[PDB]
RNA sequence: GAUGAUG
RNA sequence: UAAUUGCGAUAACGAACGAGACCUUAACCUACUAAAUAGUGGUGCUAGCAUUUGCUGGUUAUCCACUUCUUAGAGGGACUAUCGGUUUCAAGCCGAUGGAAGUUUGAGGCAAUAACAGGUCUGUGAUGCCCUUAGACGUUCUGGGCCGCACGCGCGCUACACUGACGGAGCCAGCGAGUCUAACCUUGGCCGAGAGGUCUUGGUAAUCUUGUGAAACUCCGUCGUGCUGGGGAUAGAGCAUUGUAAUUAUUGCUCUUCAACGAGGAAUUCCUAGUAAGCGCAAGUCAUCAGCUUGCGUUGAUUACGUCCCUGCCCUUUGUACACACC
């Protein structure tokens, strides 16, 4: 299956009962000007590149 | 150093002192199956017998084995120092001996039975099966039997 | 954290209200002035006092500081 | 006349009054001397449980007594050596003078 | 004999030695003076002598079977 | 250019000198070379039973060349190891005093060492000649 | 008698256990803490 | 006298002293060539200050090092600091400023420790454990 | 196998030159000679010039095919 | 690692470092799962994996498999690691690293 | 918004 | 903000203890004052290899100089200084340059009020009251025991092996201690397989033991996935050391005997960098005996830079039939 790439443009906060899940907003490389918010599992900064296995799943917040 | 081919006369076991010894183990460590033949008794005997230690135990010719065994049985005769043997100043004889094969256990049963008939503390403990070298028995050696 | 205690806040304030014309923005200069204008018991506390006095001096250049 | 005057005290302040006295006194008599040689400080540590009875969390305590030693060498006439050994007696400082 | 000699000297600032004051109170208590009278006696003298603070605590069987401490102080002491 | 013992790796020199002495054959060997083990810390006697004594002599020869003096004690320290002690933990244990004494007495009878003021042994003018001569050969064999 | 726990006692309280012998103090650990300041052992680090 | 310079480097307790003077290109550590330094695997740590700036600079000089303290690994790091420091101090006193600056720029851009010591030092033990921070095991029944 | 017959000695020389990389272990899983006998095999094949060394070390011997 | 880099060049006639890099970039799992629950009852939920952690978990898998494959084996450590790095960079399901990656990403897809 | 009695 | 640390707000105003300051120690100084009981260079004498003025040592009875490394006394240095972002823009916070050093620079010492019916009368010639006080619970002598073993638990030490065991070589620390109403730490020589024995010697110590030539570690070899050269329990026999005396083996050495243990169930401990962990040394006890404790150094990662889910802590608001206070 295809895989799409996106670029973190902001880090919103932290979630999970124990803080191991940061929340980010991203900008897709191809077809930019589409942004999605989703959760990540390890340390992360601005300008990082994330490989998204499925593009269209916007992620919920525990608070 | 190079590889050398060998004949098909290899024997895979050999009987010494009524025990069978594997032939696929280096010569020094092969004899260790014989009770009494410990690690440093094989090393010294095998070099008094002037055998090439690098060969396997099944690589030896018939004469070499009997050469080795003869040394093993009367070690002092070939100048194995007294302090290499397992029995010295025998309690009944005053002589020195090295004990091999079945003699090791038989002598052992004779050692305890001595203390038992004398009824010494050591002999008492052995008959009871407990630890005899001053250890604590409160927390140790529970499931020994 | 680099918060400064009341001993530092007030000793620095007490020097500006008496020695504005003689104080400068230089830490090295202010540091030597505070030897002749005060009796302090340690190099560490003296350095901190002179440091915060310098900090307030920059503030006054921008305008009046409260209090 | 070679002499070696040594000093041992547990507190530096008193010991620098004595040492500074010795060197400044010798230079006004223009004697020849070594400098005040300062040997490594040797510290004494005692470790001990605070508790006097064995109960409670295992809390250990350490103490320290410090010893500062110094010596100077003098080559001076005996008459001046006599009064030198006599002056600069101070509590808490110990002095020994050896000839040759 | 003849090498060790003992000298005496009257202690300077009699009212600012903890040994002197504590010993003063011990004899007062053995004679039958009250605990409250004694403790404030020590405090008042020390403060008159120029001290910046005093504190005296007496713990034991002051009044009944149970043991308790009791504190007296003046001025401002430091602890750390 | 000249050459000194310090200009050649330790591993090469020790084998080179040990061989030279083995060919030369006048070093005295104490006879118990088949029974003794080199320390109480060990459990098996040397594996190279033929040449272990010659190797030890070479090591001591270089060891003196570097430094002023040594004694049988200093060599026991240096050739100790970790005793097993079984269930209990390890501990440094000193080496065989007999072996190290009879390699220093042997080295004197060959003229490589001498007793020195201030105790212990020391290199001799003849000792330095032999070791230095063999170092230059070992370099030559770098081809 | 020439040796052992019975040959040594705290010079202050006659106690037999806990005695410290370093530097020839020979004072039991309890009494040492009491007398430490006078002997000259202070608490620094 | 011939030009000379004395410098030093440290790591943990190891320390090495490098005497440097105008010469023919000798580089000996502990009275032996630099080629025989042990442990073997780390020989290129000692060679690094030479290679990084070319062997040319070292032709007109003699360098003699000596090491003490620490252990097998920490000593090697002391040697490499002494050699780099000696070259910079020599160019300070006997060549010119520019050469010292450009040298320093190469050494720093690769590895800072070649010139500035490592500030780390060990922590004391604290009673109640086998280490500075570790503790003995606790049990409740 | 601890010692080798002719049927094995010839077996070595006829298959070992095809191995991309050979070592003490490679000669023990392709053909079943022991660990000890693999080491003498390596040194013999080195002298005879059938295999090259890339590096030599006490614990890890690396060889490759001759060129 | 001096021995292992050497074995890679012989076995593949390719730059050995580049093989190590490829092994890293083919093992870092892209999607993982996190425990999530309320009051004590819990379940899994899918999340994305960050760049740095992709490298971290890559290295751990490559060296854990190489360590476990050599234990109680005739092969040396430099060899088992050499085989592990060669297979993973090829994308071969024989490697411990690759198989584990797919186990993590399969679970993640089922817990979206 | 799963479970959690007693001294 | 680490902090009842500050900015402020304000029916409160001015104060005191605690935190911070303070002290100890670890990092830097080619700058002051010095120093063979610490060092380095040069020069007298000298051994070896080459010999052009070279390379490495010896000589602490040669003497001269010097202070980079080592020691201390007195001082310098850091204050988040400077610069850029950020909050009414105040306290602060994030990042970068420079620097030995920028998580209050790292680690400690000290450390309030008020409490526990916490531990201790077996540290004390510190103590009230009860008991005992000569056929004694006083004091002391001989001999036992506190070590006894069907089982249950808590600190630990060895391991279950090729990232290894064994053999020969390589070769490096820091913190310490050492002789009076006297035998301590021991170089060196010689005998002995070993433990150890004997004759001498220095050190009442930056002087000598002691570069405490320590272990893990590197290199070159032997063995080859075999409860095997992994493992060394449990046993037999002999030689030694300390002690009046070792039997219930005090401990050390030598040969032999060669068990469980194949990575460990429910559970559960410790830890954020010279830290965890691997490795050993000195000191405390000590005639002898460390698998323990207090410090010390050598080798040196992985993983967060967060959260309030489990266990708890501090502050505010709120309900209570609790006050021995949710047991």
UniProtKB/Swiss-Prot annotation, chain C:
Belongs to the eukaryotic ribosomal protein eS17 family. Component of the small ribosomal subunit (SSU). Mature yeast ribosomes consist of a small (40S) and a large (60S) subunit. The 40S small subunit contains 1 molecule of ribosomal RNA (18S rRNA) and 33 different proteins (encoded by 57 genes). The large 60S subunit contains 3 rRNA molecules (25S, 5.8S and 5S rRNA) and 46 different proteins (encoded by 81 genes). Present with 30500 molecules/cell in log phase SD medium. The chain holds residues 2 to 68 of 136 of the full protein. Disulfide bonds: none annotated. It is found in: Cytoplasm. This is Small ribosomal subunit protein eS17B. It comes from the Eukaryota. Component of the ribosome, a large ribonucleoprotein complex responsible for the synthesis of proteins in the cell. The small ribosomal subunit (SSU) binds messenger RNAs (mRNAs) and translates the encoded message by selecting cognate aminoacyl-transfer RNA (tRNA) molecules. The large subunit (LSU) contains the ribosomal catalytic site termed the peptidyl transferase center (PTC), which catalyzes the formation of peptide bonds, thereby polymerizing the amino acids delivered by tRNAs into a polypeptide chain.
Curated annotation (Swiss-Prot), chain D:
Keywords: Acetylation, Cytoplasm, Isopeptide bond, Ribonucleoprotein, Ribosomal protein, Ubl conjugation. GO terms for biological process: cytoplasmic translation; maturation of SSU-rRNA from tricistronic rRNA transcript (SSU-rRNA, 5.8S rRNA, LSU-rRNA). There is a cross-link at residues 2, 13, 82 (Glycyl lysine isopeptide (Lys-Gly) (interchain with G-Cter in ubiquitin)). The keyword Zinc does not apply. GO terms for cellular component: cytoplasm; cytosol; cytosolic small ribosomal subunit. It is found in: Cytoplasm. Its main location: cytoplasm. GO terms for molecular function: mRNA binding; structural constituent of ribosome. N-terminally acetylated by acetyltransferase NatA. Also partially acetylated by NatC. Component of the ribosome, a large ribonucleoprotein complex responsible for the synthesis of proteins in the cell. The small ribosomal subunit (SSU) binds messenger RNAs (mRNAs) and translates the encoded message by selecting cognate aminoacyl-transfer RNA (tRNA) molecules. The large subunit (LSU) contains the ribosomal catalytic site termed the peptidyl transferase center (PTC), which catalyzes the formation of peptide bonds, thereby polymerizing the amino acids delivered by tRNAs into a polypeptide chain. Belongs to the universal ribosomal protein uS10 family. This is Small ribosomal subunit protein uS10. It comes from Saccharomyces cerevisiae (strain ATCC 204508 / S288c) (Baker's yeast). The gene is RPS20.
Swiss-Prot record, chain H:
Signal peptide: none annotated. It is found in: Cytoplasm. GO terms for biological process: maturation of SSU-rRNA from tricistronic rRNA transcript (SSU-rRNA, 5.8S rRNA, LSU-rRNA); translational initiation. PROSITE patterns: RIBOSOMAL_S9. It holds the Pfam family Ribosomal_S9. One of its GO terms (molecular function) is structural constituent of ribosome. There is a cross-link at residues 28, 45, 57 (Glycyl lysine isopeptide (Lys-Gly) (interchain with G-Cter in ubiquitin)). The modification Phosphothreonine is found at residue 68. The modification Phosphoserine is found at residues 32, 59, 74. GO terms for cellular component: 90S preribosome; cytosol; cytosolic small ribosomal subunit. Residues 121-141 are annotated as: Disordered. Residues 132-141 have a biased composition (Basic residues). InterPro entries: Ribosomal_Su5_D2-typ_SF, Ribosomal_uS9, Ribosomal_uS9_CS, Ribsml_uS5_D2-typ_fold_subgr. Keywords: Acetylation, Cytoplasm, Isopeptide bond, Phosphoprotein, Ribonucleoprotein, Ribosomal protein, Ubl conjugation. Belongs to the universal ribosomal protein uS9 family. Component of the small ribosomal subunit (SSU). Mature yeast ribosomes consist of a small (40S) and a large (60S) subunit. The 40S small subunit contains 1 molecule of ribosomal RNA (18S rRNA) and 33 different proteins (encoded by 57 genes). The large 60S subunit contains 3 rRNA molecules (25S, 5.8S and 5S rRNA) and 46 different proteins (encoded by 81 genes). Present with 33800 molecules/cell in log phase SD medium. There are 2 genes for uS9 in yeast. This is Small ribosomal subunit protein uS9A. It comes from Saccharomyces cerevisiae (strain ATCC 204508 / S288c).
Curated annotation (Swiss-Prot), chain I:
GO terms for molecular function: structural constituent of ribosome. It is found in: Cytoplasm. One of its GO terms (cellular component) is cytosol. GO terms for biological process: cytoplasmic translation. Transmembrane segments: none annotated. Coiled coil: none annotated. Keywords: Cytoplasm, Methylation, Ribonucleoprotein, Ribosomal protein. It comes from the Eukaryota. The keyword Oxidoreductase does not apply. Signal peptide: none annotated. It is presumed that the precursor part of S25 is engaged in assembling of the small subunit, thus being essential in ribosome maturation. Belongs to the eukaryotic ribosomal protein eS25 family. Component of the small ribosomal subunit (SSU). Mature yeast ribosomes consist of a small (40S) and a large (60S) subunit. The 40S small subunit contains 1 molecule of ribosomal RNA (18S rRNA) and 33 different proteins (encoded by 57 genes). The large 60S subunit contains 3 rRNA molecules (25S, 5.8S and 5S rRNA) and 46 different proteins (encoded by 81 genes). Component of the ribosome, a large ribonucleoprotein complex responsible for the synthesis of proteins in the cell. The small ribosomal subunit (SSU) binds messenger RNAs (mRNAs) and translates the encoded message by selecting cognate aminoacyl-transfer RNA (tRNA) molecules. The large subunit (LSU) contains the ribosomal catalytic site termed the peptidyl transferase center (PTC), which catalyzes the formation of peptide bonds, thereby polymerizing the amino acids delivered by tRNAs into a polypeptide chain. The chain holds residues 39 to 105 of 108 of the full protein.
């Amino acid at each position: 299956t295809p895989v799409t790439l996106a670029k973190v443009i902001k880090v919103l906060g932290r979630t999970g009962s124990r803080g191991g899940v940061t929340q980010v907003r991203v900008e897709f490389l191809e077809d930019t000007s589409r942004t999605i918010v989703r959760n990540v599992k390890g340390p992360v900064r601005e300008n990082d590149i994330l490989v998204l296995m499925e593009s269209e799943r916007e992620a919920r917040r525990l608070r | 150093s190079l590889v050398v081919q060998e004949q098909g006369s290899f024997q895979h076991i050999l009987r010494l002192l009524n025990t069978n010894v594997d032939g696929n183990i280096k010569i020094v460590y092969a004899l260790t199956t014989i009770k009494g033949v410990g690690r440093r008794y094989s090393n010294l005997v095998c070099k008094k017998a002037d055998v090439d230690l690098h060969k396997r135990a099944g690589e030896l010719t018939q004469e070499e084995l009997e050469r080795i065994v003869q040394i093993m049985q009367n070690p002092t005769h070939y100048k194995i120092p007294a302090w290499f043997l397992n029995r010295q100043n025998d309690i009944t004889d005053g002589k020195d001996y090295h004990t091999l094969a079945n003699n090791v256990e038989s002598k052992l049963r004779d050692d305890l039975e001595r203390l038992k008939k004398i009824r010494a503390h050591r002999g008492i403990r052995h008959f009871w099966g407990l630890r005899v070298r001053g250890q604590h028995t409160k927390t140790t050696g529970r499931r020994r039997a | 954290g680099r918060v400064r205690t009341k001993t530092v806040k007030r000793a620095s304030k007490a020097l500006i209200e008496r020695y504005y014309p003689k104080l400068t923005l230089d830490f090295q200069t202010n540091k030597r002035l505070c030897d002749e204008i005060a009796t302090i018991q340690s190099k560490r506390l003296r350095n901190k006092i002179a440091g915060y006095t310098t900090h307030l001096m920059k503030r006054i250049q921008k305008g009046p500081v409260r209090g | 006349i070679k002499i070696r005057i040594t000093l041992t005290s547990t507190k530096v302040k008193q010991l620098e009054n004595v040492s500074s006295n010795i060197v400044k006194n010798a230079e006004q008599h223009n004697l020849v001397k070594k400098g005040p040689v300062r040997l490594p400080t040797k510290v004494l540590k005692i470790s001990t449980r605070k508790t006097p009875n064995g109960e409670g969390s295992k809390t250990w305590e350490t103490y320290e007594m410090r010893i500062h030693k110094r010596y100077i060498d003098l080559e001076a006439p005996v008459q001046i050596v006599k009064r030198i050994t006599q002056i600069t007696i101070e509590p808490g400082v110990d002095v020994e003078v050896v000839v040759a | 004999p003849g090498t060790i000699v003992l000298y005496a000297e009257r202690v300077q600032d009699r009212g600012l030695s903890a040994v002197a004051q504590a010993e003063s109170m011990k004899f007062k208590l053995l004679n039958g003076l009250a605990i409250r009278r004694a403790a404030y006696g020590v405090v008042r003298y020390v403060m008159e002598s120029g001290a910046k603070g005093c504190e005296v605590v007496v713990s034991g069987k002051l009044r009944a079977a149970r043991a308790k401490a009791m504190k007296f102080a003046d001025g401002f002491l430091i602890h750390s | 250019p000249g050459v000194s013992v310090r200009d050649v790796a330790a591993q090469d020199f020790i084998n080179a000198y040990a061989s030279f002495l083995q060919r030369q054959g006048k070093l005295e060997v104490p006879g118990y070379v088949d029974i003794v083990k080199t320390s109480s810390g060990n459990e098996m006697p040397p594996q190279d039973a033929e040449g272990w004594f010659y190797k030890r002599a070479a090591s001591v020869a270089r060891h003196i060349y570097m430094r002023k003096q040594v004694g049988v004690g200093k060599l026991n320290k240096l050739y100790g190891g970790a005793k097993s002690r079984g269930v209990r933990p390890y501990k440094h244990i000193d080496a065989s005093g007999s072996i190290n004494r009879k390699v220093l007495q042997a080295l004197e009878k060959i003229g490589i060492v001498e007793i020195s003021p201030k105790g212990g042994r020391r290199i001799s003018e003849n000792g330095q000649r032999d070791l230095d001569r063999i170092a230059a050969q070992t370099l030559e064999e770098d081809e | 008698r020439r040796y052992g726990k019975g040959s040594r006692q705290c010079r202050v309280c006659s106690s037999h256990t806990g005695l410290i012998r370093k530097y020839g103090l020979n004072i039991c650990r309890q009494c040492f803490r009491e007398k430490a300041n006078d002997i000259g052992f202070n608490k620094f680090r | 006298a011939v030009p000379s310079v004395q410098t030093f480097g440290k790591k943990k307790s190891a320390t090495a002293v490098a005497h440097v003077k105008a010469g023919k290109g000798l580089i000996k550590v502990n009275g032996s060539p630099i080629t025989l330094v042990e442990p073997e695997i780390l020989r290129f740590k000692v060679y690094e200050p030479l290679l990084l700036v070319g062997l040319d600079k070292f032709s007109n000089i003699d360098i003699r090092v000596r090491v003490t303290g620490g252990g097998h690994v920490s000593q090697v790091y002391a040697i490499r600091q002494a050699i780099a420091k000696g070259l910079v101090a020599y160019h300070q006193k006997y060549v010119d400023e520019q050469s010292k600056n450009e040298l320093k720029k190469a050494f720093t851009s690769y590895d800072r420790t070649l010139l500035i010591a490592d500030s780390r030092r060990p922590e004391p033990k604290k009673f109640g454990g086998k280490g500075a921070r570790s503790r003995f095991q606790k049990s409740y029944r | 196998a601890v010692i080798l017959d002719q049927e094995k000695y010839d077996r070595i020389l006829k298959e070992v030159p095809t191995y991309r990389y050979v070592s003490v272990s490679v000669l023990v899983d392709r053909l079943k000679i022991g660990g000890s006998l693999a080491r003498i095999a390596l040194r013999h094949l080195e002298k005879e010039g059938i295999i090259k060394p890339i590096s030599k070390h006490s614990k890890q011997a690396i060889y490759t095919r001759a060129t | 690692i001096k021995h292992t880099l050497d074995i890679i060049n012989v076995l593949t006639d390719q730059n050995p470092i580049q093989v190590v890099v490829d092994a890293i970039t083919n093992t870092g799992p892209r999607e993982d799962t996190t425990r999530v629950g309320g009051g004590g009852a819990a379940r899994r939920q899918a999340v994305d994996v960050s760049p740095l952690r992709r490298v971290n978990q890559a290295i751990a898998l490559l060296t854990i498999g190489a360590r476990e494959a050599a234990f109680r084996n005739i092969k040396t450590i430099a060899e088992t690691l050499a085989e592990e790095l060669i297979n993973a960079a090829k994308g071969s399901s024989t490697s411990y690293a690759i198989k584990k990656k797919d186990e993590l990403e399969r679970v993640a897809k089922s817990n979206r």
